[PDB]
Design a protein around this nucleic acid. Sequence first.
RNA 1: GCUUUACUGCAGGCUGUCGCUGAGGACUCUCACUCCGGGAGGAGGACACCGAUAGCCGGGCA
RNA 2: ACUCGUACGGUCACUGAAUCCUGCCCAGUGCAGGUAUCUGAACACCUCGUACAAGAGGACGAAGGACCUGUCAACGGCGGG
RNA 3: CGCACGGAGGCGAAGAACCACAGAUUUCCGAAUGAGAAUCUCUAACAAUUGCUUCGCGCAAUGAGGAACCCCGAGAACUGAAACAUCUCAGUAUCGGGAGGAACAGAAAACGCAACGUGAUGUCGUUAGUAACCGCGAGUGAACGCGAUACAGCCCAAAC
Lengths: 46, 119, 237, 194
Amino acid sequence: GKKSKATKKRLAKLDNQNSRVPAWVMLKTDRRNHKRRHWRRNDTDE
Amino acid sequence: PVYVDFDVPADLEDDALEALEVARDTGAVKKGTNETTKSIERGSAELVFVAEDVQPEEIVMHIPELADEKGVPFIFVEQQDDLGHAAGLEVGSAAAAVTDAGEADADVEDIADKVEELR
Amino acid sequence: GRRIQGQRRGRGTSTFRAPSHRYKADLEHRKVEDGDVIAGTVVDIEHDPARSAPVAAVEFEDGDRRLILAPEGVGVGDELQVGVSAEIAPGNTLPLAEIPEGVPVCNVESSPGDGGKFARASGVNAQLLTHDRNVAVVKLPSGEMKRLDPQCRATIGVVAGGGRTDKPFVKAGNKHHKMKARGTKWPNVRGVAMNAVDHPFGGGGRQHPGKPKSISRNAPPGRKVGDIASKRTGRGG
Amino acid sequence: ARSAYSYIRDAWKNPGDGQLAELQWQRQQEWRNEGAVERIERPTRLDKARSQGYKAKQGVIVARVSVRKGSARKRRHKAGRRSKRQGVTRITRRKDIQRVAEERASRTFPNLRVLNSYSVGQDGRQKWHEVILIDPNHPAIQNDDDLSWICADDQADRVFRGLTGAGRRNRGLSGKGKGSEKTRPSLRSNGGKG
RNA sequence: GCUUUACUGCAGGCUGUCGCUGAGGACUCUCACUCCGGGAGGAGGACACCGAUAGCCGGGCA
RNA sequence: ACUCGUACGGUCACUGAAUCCUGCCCAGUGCAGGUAUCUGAACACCUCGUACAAGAGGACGAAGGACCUGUCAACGGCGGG
RNA sequence: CGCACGGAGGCGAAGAACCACAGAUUUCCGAAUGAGAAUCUCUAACAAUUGCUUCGCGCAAUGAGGAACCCCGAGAACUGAAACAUCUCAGUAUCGGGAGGAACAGAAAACGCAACGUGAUGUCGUUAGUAACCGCGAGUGAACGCGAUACAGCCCAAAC
Ligand SMILES: [Cl-]
Ligand SMILES: [Cl-]
Ligand SMILES: [Cl-]
Ligand SMILES: [K+]
Ligand SMILES: [Mg+2]
Ligand SMILES: [Mg+2]
Ligand SMILES: [Mg+2]
Ligand SMILES: [Mg+2]
Ligand SMILES: [Mg+2]
Ligand SMILES: [Mg+2]
Ligand SMILES: [Mg+2]
Ligand SMILES: [Mg+2]
Ligand SMILES: [Mg+2]
Ligand SMILES: [Mg+2]
Ligand SMILES: [Mg+2]
Ligand SMILES: [Mg+2]
Ligand SMILES: [Mg+2]
Ligand SMILES: [Mg+2]
Ligand SMILES: [Mg+2]
Ligand SMILES: [Mg+2]
Ligand SMILES: [Mg+2]
Ligand SMILES: [Mg+2]
Ligand SMILES: [Mg+2]
Ligand code: NA
Ligand code: NA
Ligand code: NA
Ligand code: NA
Ligand code: NA
Ligand code: NA
Ligand code: NA
Ligand code: NA
Ligand code: NA
Ligand code: NA
Ligand code: NA
Ligand SMILES: [Sr+2]
Ligand SMILES: [Sr+2]
Ligand SMILES: [Sr+2]
Ligand SMILES: [Sr+2]
Ligand SMILES: [Sr+2]
Ligand SMILES: [Sr+2]
Ligand SMILES: [Sr+2]
Ligand SMILES: [Sr+2]
Ligand SMILES: [Sr+2]
């Protein structure tokens, strides 16, 4: 499949949203990424 | 067209519009269909003018039959804007009436006679 | 029930439509003002996918390349004239008034100047019989005496491709190919072989129609099937 | 004395008699070849137009609208309906042809507001109505002490809400007493029983 | 769901009548209206179409 | 839509290659044609009625029906004595 | 120095943080309006429909949104009737169009406790399950008046 520029920006964003909650937020809140999406297990849009 | 039963020659019309221009500057004239109709009814009309290009034909439709039962003579003008200019207006007029002529009484009398002969 | 096949037809879907995009030309007569000085040379003889009969490619004096309905015997190089005082040769188009009685004619017009309606199929012809100042009686291929206007144009001679109906199709595949070029859904499943829901003749334990086949003219679409307003049926009597 | 207007009025009392009979036979031939909504410079019935609110001013528009004759153009039920609700032919709409005309006119002119309308005849298959429309944005109207009421925000799309005289008459609002129990103040307030 | 000479109705077809619609129980005409023609013009014509109503048929459909 | 189509067409049905053939029946039902006569709605028209209206009756009478004819490769039938 | 209690660092007496009002900025798609397009792209843009008009997009209008309410149109069936067709469910559900901060209505061709009477319109209480409707079955169902709320009356067309 051939992706467009906008489709690429969205996929790019979804990949960034897939990073873990930083180590410092755990210490600041004194103690979970609920939007964890896998390439196989989960499904994106379009 | 529906109210027109006779075609008035260009020469007779030229005479008629010339007589109307001197009728305002000496005597008195009525401008507009409402003021023409009231003159025929009040009897104070000597010669009534009516345009041929009136759309809708309803506005002026009554003048030929009303003048016949009131003895008032009438004449047809081809264009609307020419009758307005002749009555002394920037706009046009569907109908004009001569309420007592002035220094044109001899001309108006002959125009009324030229039309009666044309039926 | 469900709408019958004849009702699905009128909706004009892909299945019931003719492959118009694959059709060559709408064979109409040339529009001349008056006179006769319009003649052309036959450049090519082509196959028309629409009627299975051949069609002639002609180039006129004024440089107009248009396809025309081909009569029998017309070939490449031949000259055909179109107009009022045209030569009474096979393949020329001139009004019914100018064409002599007892001469086979094709591509006859209904209303003068329409381009031809009658006698256009393979090998058929209309026969011109009686003349008047008002009417020209033309006997159409069905054997019907059609009273026409003398100003209606017509091409002289029978239509080409005659005797097509003489040789059988032999196999279903040949019918398949012919039908894929026309505006017809093929094959035909008998109503008597369908379910009650699908056709008035459907249903039962054995295949037979429900009521008699001869239906009234006033019957609604969905019920008008079988023998439509038959004056009689059968061969005998 | 009689006005010139009173003669146009008296002529339209019988549109099948006299000079008007010939005028309609001629005009309708041109009208049948015109559109659905045709803007016209001057009204065919001056008396009626002026009576309804028309002024020969800027921002006062008149348009002739032709709508088809007869009952409802209704589709037959494609689902189960009891005998009562199985009708197609004898059903008529609850809005008169005059109102369908006024609406078609106001849609052709999305900036203008319907003032009124009047009948200008019919042939065997269609009816003609001329609609007086007003420009609420033109200062020639915003300063008119007779027509400035139509410039108010609450008069926006007035024909579609039945605020026209033809609207109010069709809504059964004519009578102030007996027979108007289910019509006033609105059909909707009375549970749609008007 | 399906059938029919089940009950009741609804589309649809045929037919009369009224409107469009005009001039001079049979007839002529042309100007509305329809169609053909690029146009000139031609065919048809107060009929047909359309709106309305009436009678008949009407498991096609509810 | 059929249709860039026009009866050697294409619509609607039945039977189901070739070969030998395909009898008899039109009373019922269906379709179609005809019809002196009978029957056949509304509008208009005439009578009564009502200062008008409701309403009652008459006159004329379309399709349809009655009646007659055609038709079974139309539904179907081809027995008892 | 947000939610958010970390680390590093920073800002604040030049009065920061914070709050109120006002203003600046305010990408792209979006009624989406130069044209096209799954939020991008291609070569000056009120696209489209209108009014006015210097007849030039010059000046303007419309479009779409909003919890429900409001107004104008389209309009079921399950159900009830112990079946069911009129009736009922119900002018309900749902659909089309449209306005406002509220809508609609509204100054009598009214009422008709018939009078020597009332006096624009909504709404509330009542009149009343009354009158009226109805396979006169099941069911359906007002109004005038009265007591309140609040009150407010005017403009054209034509005559001249
Ligand atoms: Cl074939
Ligand atoms: Cl409006
Ligand atoms: Cl009172
Ligand atoms: K029901
Ligand atoms: Mg990564
Ligand atoms: Mg052709
Ligand atoms: Mg064959
Ligand atoms: Mg095919
Ligand atoms: Mg088969
Ligand atoms: Mg089967
Ligand atoms: Mg069936
Ligand atoms: Mg079999
Ligand atoms: Mg069989
Ligand atoms: Mg039910
Ligand atoms: Mg309310
Ligand atoms: Mg045409
Ligand atoms: Mg059934
Ligand atoms: Mg078999
Ligand atoms: Mg764009
Ligand atoms: Mg029940
Ligand atoms: Mg009961
Ligand atoms: Mg009720
Ligand atoms: Mg009351
Ligand atoms: Na996946
Ligand atoms: Na508008
Ligand atoms: Na009602
Ligand atoms: Na079932
Ligand atoms: Na028989
Ligand atoms: Na902002
Ligand atoms: Na704009
Ligand atoms: Na402009
Ligand atoms: Na029950
Ligand atoms: Na049941
Ligand atoms: Na009932
Ligand atoms: Sr998977
Ligand atoms: Sr002018
Ligand atoms: Sr053509
Ligand atoms: Sr043709
Ligand atoms: Sr069967
Ligand atoms: Sr036989
Ligand atoms: Sr608006
Ligand atoms: Sr028979
Ligand atoms: Sr008061």
